[PDB]
């Protein structure tokens, strides 16, 4: 299967370079025949005679029109002639780009900024990764002493580990005797170690938690100063520091640099990206705790090494689980957009949509659209939005199902056939007439993405049946990554239309979709309300909550089903809503923030569960609990007394301490927070240790009852002595336990007040609370 694909000049001619690896051997073939092009919308073709002498200097090169072809395309759904420039380099586009466009036969140029290896990929028809070849992975991670205060990369690496299917191991310099360490002499050492066992793994996957912008970067940095020559590709090449957005992306020539932290910041999302959270929302379970204090402790102190080299052995395992676990999923959209997975990995789903567009605009001989330019990126100013939203009937209820749209968007988008080459089209004999802002989409002729989208959701059902049918599990997961990358890709079309950057973008577009959506959606509710005597609990966007008051379980779901094949008999065309589940009992605090249970005893909250950097345990159970009580018990007395006991029970010190280790990734050097806070104390505290922790890293505290403002003394767990040191119980209560239950009772009638007796050690200072939540 094709891995990526770069180009190199030689004698300044581009050769096309194809990474792959076909039964199990790696090979990398060239293509020393592929001419970079453009086109040109001419206002009569006669000028072409004096395009094709347009030049323009390079280095002092003369660069010059290779050749033209006139061609016959399609562009906003009316057929178009435009010339096909040739030229020798794709570097010397941008040089001659310009003056051609100058002229004044010129009505203008396109295709002229697609990326040469790219370009490759969508002409020679090419899917990057095809087939299921046995891709060999690795991940590694690193760890570093700080040196608050210097140029990065100033104190050195103290160990390299890394994992695969033969287990994990720690290179290090360090004094450490276990089984899965190895002990070299130097940094040196231990760099061109951990280079040797890459280059003799030959793995094709590189996997990291943030490699992009650290890792790489520090073993360069390094590797400069010891003198090492960092080389990690199946080029020989170094890794390429190349920069993306305000951040930076390496890439590994001939292996695949899968830097886990984009994606997964970009599948799912909660407070705090840290490997630690991320693991636990990825697999339920509990990865091995942090203890960003012990390791610096280890490095100054000597003391700890063997617990300091288990943990990142562990950093190492969770990450090559955490990329044997999002790879799959991401080699899939590789293949349905055609393009690499370095790149789909690192990409905005913009963007992704953006080179699925240009892959079938090229298959379907479409002219593309020029990205805006800077003034025209003005111009598209977002701010407008607008899904149906519901304010709920707050209280508990039971008997619930959900109802949501298959795909709504996707669905009107085709049904409606909206595009921008089908927008008020003149002596248009068909059209559907947008519910709001009142655009006229064109139905004479199917627009060049509707068709697309429908494609795409038709190939969706279709993986989906062959998915079902297959017995084997292992091929079935396979089908089942096809048909998700299907749905986030086509779940990515509403926000393309409004995309800044979008070749194809039309603000009339995502208007009427999104006034369609709320048509329907309030076409739903009135139905269901009017003719099945439901009523709508919650409503945002493409589905709602439903019950039937007094009615049984059994009723309720019965009825919502008899519902739908009534509802989707009336719905036009694509739109159907569908029965996402019943529930026993939920209740909503507000728009978006609700919580249910299933039969299974589950609860899926939505707007409630924690907001920033700085949690705990004491925080996380209590609301837990609370929401258990509620949901499983149907109990909202025995939440509010169960908060009142946690209470009690934090005012006389009867709450376990480790239950009250706060978790924080630091942004900044801690000697540099706010004066107010506990970050100060614990700089403090760990520079008394001698010890200097980088921002990013997870620091593990507890807020001590101290002589100033409260939460004002805190000190690093490991220096927790009960004998001598006390919490500070206000803390625990006031900015820890009761925000994070404050808003859920409130649904309930419960003031503040009541969630804590009146002889309490009341401080009456909600001042503590967490600013601006």
Same mark, same amino acid.
């Given at each position: ?7 190199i000049?030689?004698?300044g001619?581009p050769?096309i370079? +194809?990474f ?11 293509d020393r025949?592929?001419?970079p092009?453009?086109y040109?919308?001419?206002?009569? =073709? ?11 200097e390079?280095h002092?090169?003369?660069?010059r029109?290779?050749?033209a072809e ?9 057929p ?11 570097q010397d ?5 310009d003056?051609?466009?100058?002229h ?8 002229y =900024? ?5 370009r490759?990929?969508?002409d020679?028809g ?6 299921d070849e046995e ?7 690193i760890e570093?002493?700080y040196?608050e205060?210097?140029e990065?990369a100033?104190?050195?690496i103290?160990?390299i580990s890394?994992?695969?299917e ?18 070299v ?5 231990? *760099?061109?170690?951990?280079l040797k066992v890459?280059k003799?793994?030959?793995?094709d996957?590189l996997?990291?938690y ?5 890792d790489?970067?520090?073993?360069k940095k390094?590797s ?6 960092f080389i990690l590709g ?7 520091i190349?920069?993306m957005?305000d951040?930076?992306a ?8 899968? #830097? ?18 991320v693991?636990?929302?990825i697999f339920?379970?509990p990865?091995?705790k942090?203890?960003?204090?012990e390791?610096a402790q ?5 003391e700890?090494?063997e617990?300091?080299a ?8 969770v990450?090559?689980e ?6 799959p999923?991401?080699?899939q959209?590789?293949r349905?957009?055609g393009q690499?997975?370095? =790149?789909?990995s690192?990409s ?9 567009l240009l892959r079938?605009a090229?298959?379907?001989?479409e002219?593309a659209p020029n990205?805006?330019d800077?003034r025209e990126?003005a111009?598209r ?11 709920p009937e707050?209280?508990l209820?039971?008997n ?14 085709i049904?409606?056939?909206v595009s921008p ?11 559907d007439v ?5 655009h006229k989409f064109?139905?004479?002729?199917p627009?060049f993405?509707?068709?697309?989208l429908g494609?795409?959701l038709?190939e969706?059902?279709k993986?989906?049946?062959?998915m079902?049918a ?8 396979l089908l ?7 749905? *986030?890709?086509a779940?990515?079309?509403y926000g393309?239309?409004?995309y800044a ?9 995502a208007?009427?979709v999104?006034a369609?959506?709320?048509q329907?959606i309030?076409?739903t509710?009135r139905?269901i309300?009017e003719k099945?005597?439901?009523?709508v609990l919650?409503?945002?966007?493409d589905g709602?909550?439903?019950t039937?008051?007094?009615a049984d379980?059994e009723?309720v ?5 008899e519902?739908l #094949?009534?509802?989707?008999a009336?719905?036009?065309g694509?739109?159907?809503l569908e ?9 909503f ?5 609700y ?9 899926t ?16 159970e209590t609301?837990?609990?609370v929401l258990?009580? +509620?949901?499983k ?22 709450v ?10 630091i942004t900044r050097d ?5 004066a ?5 104390a614990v700089?403090k505290?760990?520079?008394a240790?001698?010890?200097?922790i ?13 002589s100033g403002?409260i939460?004002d003394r805190?000190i690093?767990? #490991?220096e927790?002595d ?5 919490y #500070?119980?206000?803390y625990?209560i ?11 009772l409130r649904?309930?009638?419960?003031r503040?007040e ?6 309490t ?5 909600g001042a ?6």
């Amino acid at each position: 299967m094709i891995l990526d694909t770069d180009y190199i000049t030689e004698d300044g001619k581009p050769v096309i370079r +194809i990474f792959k690896k076909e039964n199990g051997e790696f090979k990398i073939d060239y293509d020393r025949n592929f001419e970079p092009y453009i086109y040109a919308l001419l206002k009569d =073709d006669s000028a072409i005679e004096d395009v094709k002498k347009i030049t323009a200097e390079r280095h002092g090169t003369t660069v010059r029109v290779v050749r033209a072809e006139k061609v016959k395309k399609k562009f906003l759904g009316r057929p178009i002639e435009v010339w096909k420039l040739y030229f020798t380099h794709p570097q010397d586009v941008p040089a001659i780009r310009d003056k051609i466009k100058e002229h004044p036969a010129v009505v203008d140029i396109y295709e002229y =900024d697609i990326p040469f290896a790219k370009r490759y990929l969508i002409d020679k028809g090419l899917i990057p990764m095809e087939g299921d070849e046995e891709l060999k992975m690795l991940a590694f991670d690193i760890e570093t002493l700080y040196h608050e205060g210097e140029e990065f990369a100033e104190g050195p690496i103290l160990m390299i580990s890394y994992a695969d299917e033969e287990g994990a191991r720690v290179i290090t310099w360090k004094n450490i005797d276990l089984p899965y360490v190895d002990v070299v002499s130097t940094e040196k050492e231990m *760099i061109k170690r951990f280079l040797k066992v890459v280059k003799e793994k030959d793995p094709d996957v590189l996997i990291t938690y943030n490699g992009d912008n650290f890792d790489f970067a520090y073993l360069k940095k390094r590797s400069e100063k010891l003198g090492v020559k960092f080389i990690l590709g199946r080029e020989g090449s170094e890794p390429k520091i190349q920069r993306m957005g305000d951040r930076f992306a390496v890439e590994v020539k001939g292996r695949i640099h899968f #830097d886990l932290y984009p994606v997964i910041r970009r599948t799912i999302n909660l407070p705090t990206y840290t490997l630690e959270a991320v693991y636990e929302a990825i697999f339920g379970q509990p990865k091995e705790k942090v203890y960003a204090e012990e390791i610096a402790q280890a490095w100054e102190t000597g003391e700890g090494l063997e617990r300091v080299a288990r943990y990142s052995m562990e950093d190492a395992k969770v990450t090559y689980e955490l990329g044997k676990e999002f790879f799959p999923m991401e080699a899939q959209l590789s293949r349905l957009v055609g393009q690499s997975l370095w =790149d789909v990995s690192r990409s905005s789903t913009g963007n992704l949509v953006e080179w699925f567009l240009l892959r079938k605009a090229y298959e379907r001989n479409e002219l593309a659209p020029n990205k805006p330019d800077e003034r025209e990126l003005a111009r598209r100013r977002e701010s407008y939005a607008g899904g149906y939203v519901k304010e709920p009937e707050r209280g508990l209820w039971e008997n619930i199902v959900y109802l949501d749209f298959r795909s709504l968007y996707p669905s009107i988008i085709i049904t409606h056939n909206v595009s921008p080459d089908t927008l008020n089209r003149e002596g248009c004999e068909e059209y559907d007439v947008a519910p709001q802002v009142g655009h006229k989409f064109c139905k004479d002729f199917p627009g060049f993405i509707p068709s697309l989208l429908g494609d795409l959701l038709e190939e969706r059902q279709k993986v989906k049946k062959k998915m079902k049918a297959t017995i084997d599990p292992i091929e079935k997961k396979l089908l089942d990554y096809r048909q998700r990358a299907i749905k *986030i890709l086509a779940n990515s079309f509403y926000g393309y239309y409004g995309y800044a950057k979008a070749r194809w973008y039309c603000k009339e577009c995502a208007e009427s979709v999104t006034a369609w959506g709320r048509q329907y959606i309030e076409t739903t509710i009135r139905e269901i309300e009017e003719k099945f005597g439901f009523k709508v609990l919650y409503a945002d966007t493409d589905g709602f909550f439903a019950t039937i008051p007094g009615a049984d379980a059994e009723t309720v779901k019965k009825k919502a089903k008899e519902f739908l #094949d009534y509802i989707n008999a009336k719905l036009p065309g694509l739109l159907e809503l569908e029965y996402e589940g019943f529930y026993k009992r939920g209740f909503f605090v507000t728009k978006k923030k609700y919580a249910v249970i299933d039969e299974e005893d589950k609860i899926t909250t939505r707007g409630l569960e924690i907001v920033r950097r700085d949690w705990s345990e004491i925080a996380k159970e209590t609301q837990a609990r609370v929401l258990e009580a +509620i949901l499983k018990h149907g109990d909202v007395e025995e939440a509010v007394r169960i908060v009142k006991e946690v209470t009690e029970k934090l005012s006389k010190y009867e709450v376990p301490p480790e239950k009250l280790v706060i978790y924080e990734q630091i942004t900044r050097d801690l000697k540099d927070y706010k004066a107010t806070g506990p970050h100060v104390a614990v700089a403090k505290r760990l520079a008394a240790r001698g010890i200097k922790i980088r921002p990013g890293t997870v620091i593990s505290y507890i807020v001590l009852k101290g002589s100033g403002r409260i939460g004002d003394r805190a000190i690093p767990f #490991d220096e927790f002595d009960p004998a001598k040191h006390k919490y #500070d119980a206000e803390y625990y209560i006031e900015n820890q336990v009761l925000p994070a239950v404050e808003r859920i009772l409130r649904a309930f009638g419960y003031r503040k007040e009541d969630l804590r007796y009146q002889k309490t050690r009341q401080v009456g200072l909600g001042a503590w609370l967490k600013p601006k939540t």
